[PDB]
Amino acid sequence: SHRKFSAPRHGSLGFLPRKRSSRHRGKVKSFPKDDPSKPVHLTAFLGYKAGMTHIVREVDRPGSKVNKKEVVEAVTIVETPPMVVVGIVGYVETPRGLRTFKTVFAEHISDECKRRFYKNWHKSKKKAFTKYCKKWQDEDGKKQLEKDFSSMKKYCQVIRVIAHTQMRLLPLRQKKAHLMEIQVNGGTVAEKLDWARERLEQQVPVNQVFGQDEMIDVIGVTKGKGYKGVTSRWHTKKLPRKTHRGLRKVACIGAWHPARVAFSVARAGQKGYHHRTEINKKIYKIGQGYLIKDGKLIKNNASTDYDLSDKSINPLGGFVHYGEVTNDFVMLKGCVVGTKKRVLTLRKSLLVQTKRRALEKIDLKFIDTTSKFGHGRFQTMEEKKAFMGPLKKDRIA
Amino acid sequence: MKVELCSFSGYKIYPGHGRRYARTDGKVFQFLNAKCESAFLSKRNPRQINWTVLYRRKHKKG
Amino acid sequence: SGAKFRISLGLPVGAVINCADNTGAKNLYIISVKGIKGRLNRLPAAGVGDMVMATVKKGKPELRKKVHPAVVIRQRKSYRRKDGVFLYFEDNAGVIVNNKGEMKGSAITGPVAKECADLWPRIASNAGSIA
RNA sequence: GUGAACUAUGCCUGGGCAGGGCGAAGCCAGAGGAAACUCUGGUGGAGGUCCGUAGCGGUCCUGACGUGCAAAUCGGUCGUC
RNA sequence: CUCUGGCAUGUUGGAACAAUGUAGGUAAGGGAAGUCGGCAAGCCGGAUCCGUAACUUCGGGAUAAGGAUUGGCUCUAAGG
RNA sequence: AAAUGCCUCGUCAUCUAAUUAGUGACGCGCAUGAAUGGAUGAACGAGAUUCCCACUGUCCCUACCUACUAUCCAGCGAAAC
RNA sequence: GACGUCGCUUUUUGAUCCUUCGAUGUCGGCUCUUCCUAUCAUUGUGAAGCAGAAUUCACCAAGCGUUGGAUUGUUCACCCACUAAUAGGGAACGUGAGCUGGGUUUAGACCGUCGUGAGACAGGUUAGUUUUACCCUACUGAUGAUGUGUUGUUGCCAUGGUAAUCCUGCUCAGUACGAGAGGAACCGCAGGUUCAGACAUUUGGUGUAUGUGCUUGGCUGAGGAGCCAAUGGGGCGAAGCUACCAUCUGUGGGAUUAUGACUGAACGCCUCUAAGUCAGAAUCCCGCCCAGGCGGAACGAUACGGCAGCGCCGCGGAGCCU
Ligand SMILES: COC(=O)c1c(OC)cc2cc3c(c(O)c2c1C)C(=O)[C@]1(OC)C(=O)C=C(OC)[C@@H](O)[C@]1(O)C3=O
Ligand SMILES: [Mg+2]
Ligand SMILES: [Mg+2]
Ligand SMILES: [Mg+2]
Ligand SMILES: [Mg+2]
Ligand SMILES: [Mg+2]
Ligand SMILES: [Mg+2]
Ligand SMILES: [Mg+2]
Ligand SMILES: [Mg+2]
Ligand SMILES: [Mg+2]
Ligand SMILES: [Mg+2]
Ligand SMILES: [Mg+2]
Ligand SMILES: [Mg+2]
Ligand SMILES: [Mg+2]
Ligand SMILES: [Mg+2]
Ligand SMILES: [Mg+2]
């Protein structure tokens, strides 16, 4: 009978087998819909979570209370060095779904890509794709390869580009690269195939994939928490202080007579390390990295045309548990799944942005680069040492 | 992007940090962190706390 | 125009705040918050700018044993104010109003939060300072 | 027929019970009254007196444990001392 | 807490530090709204100086209630 | 309308925003009542009940930390059913 | 909808005694899930003694929500208050190896009535031990198994789950409507509630980094440096974890239901219906999102410095088992 007081469902049943993710990267699982009227472009990218900071911008929202006033918003920094396209896969759609027809790889694949192909690079002979690049440099193999290209052109409906990240530009311990299939959209199959084989063996920047102040989706693996109980895992109400065999339980699991524990009651188990797909993450800024023209320059990072300083995106003491960003970055609005150093699939949206919350051009006033390793109170080393004057070690120096 | 000065320590409070304390007398105060906040509410003298700008300007450390 | 953003509440039902106008009340004992649909076991709570139903526990006898609408003007609990700054007050205070927002009193002792001063123009008129 | 080696109660002969609080009678002095006496300050150390050890007991957590350390125990909190 | 005396952690060790426990803490803002019920926990606490109500069998209540002070160091008086 | 009143959540007052609770009254009291003791008490109570102040994770609404477990291993190794 | 009359339901209480007395833990609350619809609100509609606003009666409809308290052990009840609304039920009158133990319902005791009494009371009162999971299944997570020669990378999607919800303010507009009093709606804009999934830049919490100051008692002859007091206490505190106590995000189609229609017979007229068309929703199905089959795919590499294996080209041969 009749639970006597209405309360909604604890947790969502659209998210469960609430188990560890089978992948570490983050599968797209749905690319944007193709229309051949658009130009040829990519639809996703692969970045790494560096850290968080906050910004100051001036809002242009007519009718809102914060119209033409300055707000502070948290941002997430994703380091995105350019991805190397090294392969291309084609798909044909069948009444059983959509199967891969033919892959073609490139000559001279890099060692971090082959590191992805091996489970123990130390004890291996590193023999992967050697007989393949043999048939690339050959001439009997060469006519075979263009025959495969022509067959792919006349039969495939969906082409995708296999691209890897280049981990030698990152502050991480991992030297093994991340590969990814990124769907190519906007054209005929012949057009996108010659476009992709033009881009073969080559670098693609996030400047070319994404743009300023558009809304994208972030796909990743939620931060891992381990084996948790029902109070942490499902946020059920804690039982009163005088409960004999434990407080952090669910007091009743189903009635007598469905005679089984249902799949919809709260149980203890794995929390976190979950594959999630969050949408409507607004890009605030695309960085530019550490270029060398002369005695080099890093203002092309967080110099915001209203401070004109010479600071990078990096805080004092660097990004905690990550390192420092020396590559192209992407600043997103808000929080994003995963730990620091976690690889994030970033992809184009598959809705249409007609919203005044969306379609909005932003303009940053300030980017906070105080130290996140404490309650840091200085933006730059020059500002800190000019505020403090000479120290004892500086004096003896 | 207005930068305020901490009421207890006299440091620069950048626009995302610290807290602001309005008293019943209409006077408001800005604190860089909870160290300065707790010293203020415990009514310590910033000219007696060694690491403050008021202390260093009184003792001519500049 | 413009609607109030969400602030941190921290002022539940059983709270006794102090009456901040010259009506002759000293205390306000919250019994309700105007606009709460609520949830199982969750206590209804208020923040600055909220109309509450309140009784006055000590004060004038012609005020004491009744229910009045009141508006919370100062909270001891810190709330973010969307220009980044977190703000909190020394006390918890509210004023007795009527159903359409007119103050029963005539003068407010102490600062009044901006999040209620923009919402209630008759309260902000009687205020001394808008903190 | 056998048991008071546990426990119940009487008797006989032994042993034991920090430190503090309140301050009964008795007593000394000073002051006020015609007396009767009264007031003040000390002293003194009574009580099935109070706080609280050892001891004796066993309130509550309806705590632990509950195929136990234990066929009734343990911890904190308690009653009396 | 330490000395004399005694011991080897109470019938085993090692490695990790999940849930649930058992025992112990802390917690913004509210302050019993929790619950049958303030259960449990918390508050208070020693001493010194003030100041103590109703009621009463005049003994008490009574540490009623309430308030202030308290460290270190250098002295000065008084008490044989 | 009591540790005694069915009707009964009796009626009035007070206490609260709201009280089958509490207290003060009322009394044709199912079925109160005078050593089957009646009515009162100061002091006392690990006795039952109500309210207020203070206080708090009892709650809003949970979180974090520590010890011993649980866990995994080496040795040892039961029982209920 | 009177007098009458036909039903349904098993959320009432009876009637019965079929099952259980070598035992099915007996009230209520708490917690948590799911179902129903006889729909309170919300979506889409039809009707009115529907001018507007409010309301009432029906239909498709159970997707989603249905609260915080005072008193009582209470289920019920009654009141305060908020709300879009505070709908009604079921699951062994769901749920005690989940709790609790206030009630009832052992032994102690008091009162009233009854009894000569021992004692009784479906009358009141007070105090009264709530045990076991390590088995199987279920469920929650965690390894693995089964073929593709081995092994890796990149992928597909069968099937299973599924999610968003409601409300204010501005404008419309003091306009339509209405004599007046009053008084809407669509588009749009700005936010909020409930829920979901995250996250830690900031604010807060934690804090044995046993980090760094202070400090009590003791101890190392003192200084200095330290230690002990089951974390000696206290102040501040990095990292990490963590809070509607901070911050971020939450979405598109198709067939259609009620209904309103088009053409149009039956019935030389009419008719949404018979044949044939249309619009149509918090429903349903799918997408998005989560998992990824004793289900598939594309591609890589495929075993010696020695006798040492493997693959392919042979009908190339001789035969064996099954
Ligand atoms: C009616 O509520 C019960 O169901 C109930 C109960 O609820 C907790 C507790 C008990 C407890 C007990 C008994 C019960 O019957 C009993 C009952 C019925 C006994 O009979 C007992 O033996 C076990 C005995 O024979 C001697 C005594 O009194 C003569 C009891 O104290 C006794 O020792 C005991 O512990
Ligand atoms: Mg219901
Ligand atoms: Mg218990
Ligand atoms: Mg930090
Ligand atoms: Mg509740
Ligand atoms: Mg004897
Ligand atoms: Mg005694
Ligand atoms: Mg004792
Ligand atoms: Mg004991
Ligand atoms: Mg027990
Ligand atoms: Mg005693
Ligand atoms: Mg030990
Ligand atoms: Mg040992
Ligand atoms: Mg031994
Ligand atoms: Mg607190
Ligand atoms: Mg506090």
Ligand SMILES: [Mg+2]
């Ligand atoms: Mg209470």
Ligand SMILES: [Mg+2]
């Ligand atoms: Mg209560």
Ligand SMILES: [Mg+2]
């Ligand atoms: Mg309640």
Ligand SMILES: [Mg+2]
């Ligand atoms: Mg207690």
Ligand SMILES: [Mg+2]
């Ligand atoms: Mg008293």
Ligand SMILES: [Mg+2]
């Ligand atoms: Mg002194």
Ligand SMILES: [Mg+2]
């Ligand atoms: Mg009574």
Ligand SMILES: [Mg+2]
């Ligand atoms: Mg009460």
Ligand SMILES: [Mg+2]
């Ligand atoms: Mg009475």
Ligand SMILES: [Mg+2]
């Ligand atoms: Mg007693």
Ligand SMILES: [Mg+2]
């Ligand atoms: Mg039967």
Ligand SMILES: [Mg+2]
């Ligand atoms: Mg028969």
Ligand SMILES: [Mg+2]
């Ligand atoms: Mg039976």
Ligand SMILES: [Mg+2]
């Ligand atoms: Mg049986």
Ligand SMILES: [Mg+2]
């Ligand atoms: Mg049984």
Ligand SMILES: [Mg+2]
């Ligand atoms: Mg059973």
